[PDB]
Structure formats: C-alpha cells, structure tokens
C-alpha cells in the first residue's frame, strides 16, 4: 500500500509502521555546526574489484541494482564499528525537479538525488539477520548535484529505458560501482533507519561529504521511469524521497576536520 503519493506517502507510513515516529529514524538534516569531528573513526575503503552485478529491476517506487553478495571480497570497510560490509544492492531517490530529491540534507540544502549503496555487516551472516541488528546495515549515501556528466553512471541511466514500468527486470552484469564514487570519502555518520517501510532502525549511516556531479541529461532519465505497471495509467516516478526526521538525542560524527 505505501508509496510516495499524497494519500500513501511518508506522512502516512506511521499508521502501519509505528517505528516511523521512533528514536532513530532516517534521513536527518546534517547541520554542520553540530557534527563533531571524531579522530577515532576508521576511514572508508572499498574493495569493489570483484563486485558482481546481476540485474536491475523496477519495483514500483525505485530501481534496484542487485549484486551477487556471495562475493566475500566485495566489501565496504571502516566506519564507527570498523566493520566489513558486503555490498548487496544500490538504488536512488530523486525529485520532480533539480532543487529536491535527496533524503539527507546538509544545513537544510536538498540535492537533486541521493544514491544509496546498501551493505550488510558480515558478522551477522546474511542480510536477513543483519536487519534485526541496530548496526546491521551500512548504507553509503552519496549526493547528486547537476553539472558535468558522471561517466560511471551512464550504464545505469541508459538501461532505465528497458525497465520503464513496475515489474520490468533486465540482466545487468559487469557494472563497476567504483564509477559512482566521488574523489573524497570524507563522511558523516550516525545511527539510523531504513528510509522506506519497514523503517527498521538497523542502519549505520555513512553519508559522503562530497557530492557527485551528474548531467541534466542523466537526471532527466530518472524521471522517465513509471511507478505503474505496463498498460496501467502512466504515473511518472518522481519525488520518491522521505524528508528529514527528528534527530532526537543522536550525535552526528564527522570523519574530517
Ligand atoms: C525490506 C527490507 C528490510 O528493506 C530494505 C531496505 C534497504 C535500504 C533502504 S534505504 N532507502 O537505503 O534506507 C530501505 C529499505 C531491504 C534491503 C534491500 C537491499 C539489500 C538489503 F540487504 C536489504 C529489505 O530487505
Ligand atoms: Zn534508499
């Protein structure tokens, strides 16, 4: 039932999922007066060499690139829990115009889109057991701003034409997610939640300081997707983002000065 419409969007989710009003919900605004530099934070490193992409899918509220997460060398490492996190999936959230679309904000600034690279902490065995733990997932969040094109994004935005409607799936092998990363891996981190139902508070959020630049042509391709299935009335897939939630007692930590 849940979606991003007026009558089933973020403001409605709490009715089915009471945790929507919990103590560790995401996304949040990152106020740069209040993030505390933490010299103990382990810097991020990626081993995406053997990351093995499988397929890309339109599930009716986003598109997901699925990975073979049995590749034990394809991991994100570091962060507050010094974790080793298996890459399993990535997806985006975006807006109906360039001035909005991101889920996290920085000093209340919204970006055009946000990329979420989803990983599960290997010490919990599989993604299913991981989402039961407060630090079970590491989601690497990366802001998208409009400017020059991102060459590593081209394979992603171009295949979207093949999965325009809900339910469409396409083989998507040999995609290298290193092509989606900015130069710097300086980051903010805080304990939070999935930003869609079931809104489980199982995420160590790692949000990169540096946005990637993508072209207007690239972002437009996001907005050609459909929420609806083939033959149904056309509803363009836009504004599939949850707004910032109460920070409550949490401290946002910065890896950088
Ligand atoms: C249904 C349930 C629990 O929700 C999510 C989910 C993940 C990330 C986000 S988000 N937007 O990044 O916070 C929101 C939701 C997954 C999931 C998806 C891909 C890989 C994985 F290991 C788990 C689930 O299995
Ligand atoms: Zn997401």
Q: Is 104 a catalytic residue?
A: no
Q: Give the 3-state secondary structure of residue 126.
A: coil
Q: Give the 3-state secondary structure of residue 148.
A: coil
The angle at the Cα of 89, spanning 85 to 94, to the nearest 5 degrees, equals 120
Ligand 2 center from residue 117 Cα (angstroms)? 8
Distance (Å, rounded) from C-alpha 176 to C-alpha 16?
37
User: Do you find a cis peptide bond into 198, omega within 30 degrees of 0?
Assistant: yes
Those residues whose C-beta lies under 8 Å from the C-beta of residue 148, and which sit 6 or more positions away, are 213, 215
In the numeric block, the tokens 């171009």 are attached to 158
Q: Is the CATH code 3.90.120.10 the one for domain 1-257?
A: no
Maximum distance among all Cα pairs of the chain, rounded to whole angstroms = 55
Closest CA to 158 of 145, 139, 178, 172: 172
Q: Out of 7, 12, 33, 61, which one is annotated catalytic?
A: 61
DSSP 109: B
User: Do you find a cis peptide bond into 251, omega within 30 degrees of 0?
Assistant: no
Those residues whose C-beta lies under 8 Å from the C-beta of residue 141, and which sit 6 or more positions away, are 27, 103, 104, 114, 115, 116, 205, 206, 207, 208
Closest CA to 194 of 124, 105, 103: 103
In the numeric block, the tokens 């409550």 are attached to 248
Distance (Å, rounded) from C-alpha 222 to C-alpha 180?
15
Q: Could you tell me the resolution of this structure in angstroms? A: 1.8
58 backbone dihedrals φ, ψ, rounded to 5°: -100, 110
């Amino acid at each position: 039932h849940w979606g991003y419409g007026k009558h089933n969007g973020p403001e409605h989710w709490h009715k089915d999922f009471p945790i929507a009003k919990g103590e560790r919900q995401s996304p949040v605004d990152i106020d740069t007066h209040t993030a505390k530099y933490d010299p103990s934070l382990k810097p991020l490193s990626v081993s995406y060499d053997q990351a093995t992409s499988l397929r890309i899918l339109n599930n009716g509220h986003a598109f997901n690139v699925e990975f073979d997460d049995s590749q034990d060398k394809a991991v994100l490492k570091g962060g507050p829990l010094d974790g080793t996190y298996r890459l399993i999936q990535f997806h985006f959230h975006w807006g109906s115009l360039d001035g909005q679309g991101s889920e996290h904000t920085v000093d209340k600034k919204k970006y055009a889109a946000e990329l979420h690279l989803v990983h599960w902490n290997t010490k919990y065995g599989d993604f299913g057991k991981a989402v039961q733990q407060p630090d079970g997932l590491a989601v690497l969040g990366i802001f998208l701003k409009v400017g020059s094109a991102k060459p590593g994004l081209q394979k992603v935005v171009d295949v979207l034409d093949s999965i325009k409607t809900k339910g469409k799936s396409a083989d998507f092998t040999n995609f290298d997610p290193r092509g989606l990363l900015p130069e710097s891996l300086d980051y903010w981190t805080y304990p939070g939640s999935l930003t869609t139902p079931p809104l489980l508070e199982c995420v160590t959020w790692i949000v990169l300081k540096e946005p990637i630049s993508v072209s207007s042509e690239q972002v437009l391709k996001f907005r050609k997707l459909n929420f609806n299935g083939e033959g149904e009335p056309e509803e363009l897939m836009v504004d599939n983002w949850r707004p910032a939630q109460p920070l409550k007692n949490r401290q946002i930590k910065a890896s950088f000065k």
